[PDB]
Symmetry: D3
Subunit: 291 residues, 6 copies
């Protein structure tokens, strides 16, 4: 820990200066999911890292999901699911559970972890002050698209009140639930949502915390791994990717095409992954830029 000469303790800090300039006064949207939210030691480091950005004058906006904890509460409550394709149909009953688990349990832990370093985080959904709206989403079941309930994409973002909040010195911890135009609340996929917030707010970077080292073009060839890719190439390769990392990837493309400078798929198993990806050239992840 300290058997490390100082002369180079100084050097690692001093090589963060370019990215401190790059990110000073800018929005950085961080999608936070996977194991980064399961292990206590990683969780506290993630929190402390949000504190870090905010004591450098960067404006983080956290967007979290919560698949597994939702399904655990549904079984605990004995709510039998219905499944079309692999998707659970989101009934009014399911929606209310998703809402109370995402907003009243998962988001609360992150808010309390970040607020140990200061009065920074505040939790919100699209319902609070109409910050964002949803629009119902059908999924393609297998050729035919069909309805799987009250799920949707982010429809509109109140960019104004959002950047009021972070300029006021606050870290928004977002739960991806939103009203539609008639007031009916839908659950939104947190990867998609994070790309939609990042684009609305003119974020400098989208950070996608995933449980993989990075994007392998030829999974699992160890050296197929890639550290940077354009949108156009990533687009043509999208249909050849593993099931779970497809949402993290179209989020990246919809954001970078949407004008975000770069989207990053990083390893949420590395402790302090965001500090590594933002202020260090030794990034585990993969960068996505337009092209």
């Amino acid at each position: 820990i300290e058997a490390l000469p100082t002369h180079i303790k100084a050097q690692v800090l001093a090589e963060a200066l370019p990215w401190l300039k790059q990110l000073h006064g800018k929005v950085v949207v961080v999608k936070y999911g996977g194991n980064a939210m399961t292990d206590d030691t990683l969780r506290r480091a993630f929190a402390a890292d949000m504190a870090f950005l905010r004591n450098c004058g960067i404006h983080p906006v956290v967007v979290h999901g919560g698949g597994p904890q939702i399904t655990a509460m549904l079984r605990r409550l004995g709510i039998e699911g219905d499944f079309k394709g692999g998707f659970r149909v989101t009934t009014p009953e399911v929606l209310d559970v998703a809402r109370m688990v995402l907003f009243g349990q998962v988001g609360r832990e992150l808010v309390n972890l970040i607020n140990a370093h200061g009065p920074y985080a505040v939790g919100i959904t699209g319902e609070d002050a109409q910050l964002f709206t949803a629009v119902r989403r059908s999924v393609t079941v297998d050729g035919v698209a069909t309805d799987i309930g009250l799920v949707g994409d982010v429809d509109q973002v109140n960019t104004a009140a959002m950047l009021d909040l972070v300029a006021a010195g606050r870290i928004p911890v977002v739960s991806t639930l939103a009203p539609d135009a008639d007031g009916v609340v839908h659950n939104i996929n947190a990867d998609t949502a994070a790309a939609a917030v990042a684009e609305a707010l003119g974020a400098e970077k989208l950070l996608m915390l995933t449980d993989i080292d990075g994007l392998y073009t030829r999974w699992p060839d160890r050296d197929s791994l890639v550290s940077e890719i354009d949108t156009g190439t990533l687009a043509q390769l999208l249909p050849t990717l593993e099931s779970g990392m497809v949402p993290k990837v179209e989020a990246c493309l919809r954001a970078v095409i949407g004008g975000v400078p770069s989207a990053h798929i990083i390893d949420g198993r590395v402790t302090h992954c965001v500090l590594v990806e933002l202020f260090t050239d030794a990034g585990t992840g993969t960068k996505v830029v337009r092209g």
Copy 2:
């Protein structure tokens, strides 16, 4: 509805003018519980009334409880309670349920009901931006006081960020959960809490929505009912009151002694009770002032 001559439609409005002057630019804390939150028609009217205040330039702050809905989720989850006196011991397991039911279910309905009239409500607990803190509370079991878990009173209120919020045009819908000084979240009794917010913010009025016509000194003598009372008399009469209305009453006294001009115990069974109590001399409730 309209078989009412207009010449007096005009008169009822014009007699709201004194209380519009009294309340323009001021904080009004409304504790919202009882049946006012059970019946849909009353609920929508309560929401529309919060919208009303806010389109007159009054600054409402809603504080809600949720006893019955909490205990319903505990039984649904099969969490066996422990009971000292009549109090349920609030385990870490119970606390997390209280939190997710108060913040992720009950507060969400009120936020969505108010936001049908505009981007006004935002939900918060004392955890968000450290708005308020708690301090653990023992209750007197029966002579001896003893511990009944993670319950406490409101400890400190960030008056500053709170009045920033309402001046920004927002209606805070508060869930009474708060960190203590070491970050551990307690459940706070929503009547107490509402008196503590009202005092911190320099509210003009505390409104206590209860399921009774008003305070009867000699329950149930029909004419023992009283429309106004001082603190000192109400204090001496406190030990002679029904079990459930004692918390609504010491909240009133701790607020009015605390410098709030008046606390009001009103009938949440009357539709639009807050509009009646605030802009009309035909108030069902009972007013509490210092003396």
Copy 3:
């Protein structure tokens, strides 16, 4: 007064909520003339109504005339008039009298009536801080137009300083006198002027207080009366109207065509007419919209 059940006292208030939302933060120009300014009881109610709007966060701007009081001072002073058509020629002598009666008598009563409810009203003419200018107006005598002295229409409005004033929480009570480009003060017809202010300021509504129930297309067929009309129809019907209500009508059309959402011709004999027309669907008057 109070033999009116409360359950419906509550209902009349709660049905003002849509127009409180419609009018919150907006300009409402009220032309104030006729009997509304002759009877003390109506006058005090008009004042209290301006106070009302301002304690709901609406921004009233009052524009008053004063034909009869001017001619009374001219006779009291023994100033013999000259008359072309039915118009009095406005000499420098007449102008100074009009000015001192409109600004130093009539406007002063309204300012003092409104200021019994608070420091709200301030009187002004177009001369103060160059708020508006005039341009001399000839009238068509009977085929030929000819000069009838220092009378004119509103030329330019300093929209900026005007909306500074009402955002500063003030109710402007305007006397319709204005400099021309060379500094010479003209009298302006207060109906015209009110339409010109309303258009300049982006008012939500123009309210024209008149001494009639509303606009009768076939005066005096009792049922020719109409509650709403477009500009285009009202235009084609303008040449068929009574002598005194023509100015109230072209003011309405020049304002609504000018982009004001609606102009209203209301009964200033009804006590609290503006409260009835603004927050109630039982409006005596007639609404004018574009078409």
Copy 4:
């Protein structure tokens, strides 16, 4: 006009610099009466001088009277006066005439004269936005004091809204009429009033435009004239002064004792007297300081 070498045109300007520093950003109250308001050439110069101060960043506040023009309108109207001592009893009838002559005639000329140089002046009385209040004043008739109607001294000044106005770049032209606490408007002596405004606003200087060269201790010994005097000496000499200059003098003492640095009694017959007194050491007037 120009047969004046420039080398000294430069010198007179450059010797205004100390008083530009002294007066930059400060309030200067100017009481404006006497011949300064009767002759057109002097009047225009007075106006242009107010424009001058305001284009140097000084904050002038003009306070005018109007004895003779009031009595002319009373005779024109055939209102017979009643006289106790030499004072006219101010009936409700007289008050309304005073008000309409001061505010609707006299103040209007000054506003239009100043506004030829820019949108600067705005007229006001104590009735507008409750800027100042009056309190009824009895005068000592001759030993015994008695009532002479609705006349009073300035009671309270809304210092706040007043300095809002001049910081907003406006020159207030004040008519000395004010409500009392029950809303009844009194006429206030414009010398007194000017001392009361100056003290309330923390004026740097009070300027009293009078029709005399200055204060002669032994009128009419030509060399009894004095250019500067303390309060205490001026106090002891007050009972030995001419009838008309006593009000100009107790105004001076009540202001300078009230904390205004200096009061000045200047010759309103000199063209541009205020420019001479403020930016030149060749002042005709007499300075009053505390002592």
Copy 5:
């Protein structure tokens, strides 16, 4: 000094009022060189004149040169010059001397002279907060252009931070040294620079303090002197001017064509020349306007 009747002391002041209106709230760039900076009495008057403008609410920006004092320090240091044409080649050694003489000696005197009247002046070069940049300049030696070292014209001006400074009440005293795009500091000709600042800031007037009465078209015919000229005529006459006044003239044309209303070539031997040129019609100088 005072044997000058006051009645006309008043008149000279009152004839400054139009130019006080013209210049209130505007930028006036004054290039300050020649004898105006050599004689102590003229220097103090120049300073006091900058103080003057700033206590009238004008925003002066001073730009100074310093040819002779630079060459004196080079000889004092024994730095042998190299000369192409009549130009000294500006070596890194020469540049550092120019910088320390212009910024650390010449500008310091002016700052301390102006700050005797108040905390107004602040010295700056283009290096401070990157206020302006330079671009290297070759001069035409005699037909062929060639390099004469680190000299350049003003490249870009941070108009924003510049007008922040003067609105903050400060008088910038500029030394004409600026970084290029790679950070290398060049010396800039102070006449050119002053025209470049004036254009960037939207100055009302450029004042060029020169050691001549004005521009003589046929030097030295006494009556060839001219008080006003357009750009187009001045352009065609530029190749027929004396060696030293050519830079003062193309500065004038590049500024007035650049949109500055007028450039003025004035006599810095006249004491208080800027006060004479700005607030008096007896200007020694010559005005340049577009045409």
Copy 6:
């Protein structure tokens, strides 16, 4: 450089978080002298470190000296010194040289080094906008105190305009020259000055860049070195210190007693010493706190 595992690249950054919280939004005064200003590689790192603080939202204020460069210019100019004790008498001739070397050479390098990372630094002396004043200082020659010319201590600091500057996002690079009350400029010892600025501005930390590892109580016993000390002990030990480090030490005590939390004597030979001392527990220097 990169043969350093990342897992601990992450760790060194994450251990800066406490001092980022401690220093966010605070003033840090850095005295910059010694070798830190002689070697190019150290100089650029010092600059980049000031950039660092400013892209974390810390407010650095640099105070530099320049003994050796002054004496070099005096010899280059052939100015013979006069010496009382070991002190050079500071003649008007010497002062002007000190001023032009400190402000026009030394401060210019630091400004240009910092401005390679952004428009941040601005140079100033106490002469600019009267930011600080001096008061002449005699030194005790050897028992008797005597005059050694225009040298003094910092007299008063305009705290207001100073913190305006850094909140405006600027890094002040201060040259220690200041006017006295009569406008005469003195040279101030840059260690003293830095303690005086730090106290005036409520700095969080004073950083004293020195050419020693730290304070040795028993120089040169290698282990007499100390990492933290109180004021009271340091006071009693002051008379037993080496000649050159006495000024760095009484600056520390006058600042910490003056209410600065801590003063630090650090090794300006270590590259990036300020980054090490501020964001790392491996500090070479010695901390001074009150006691």
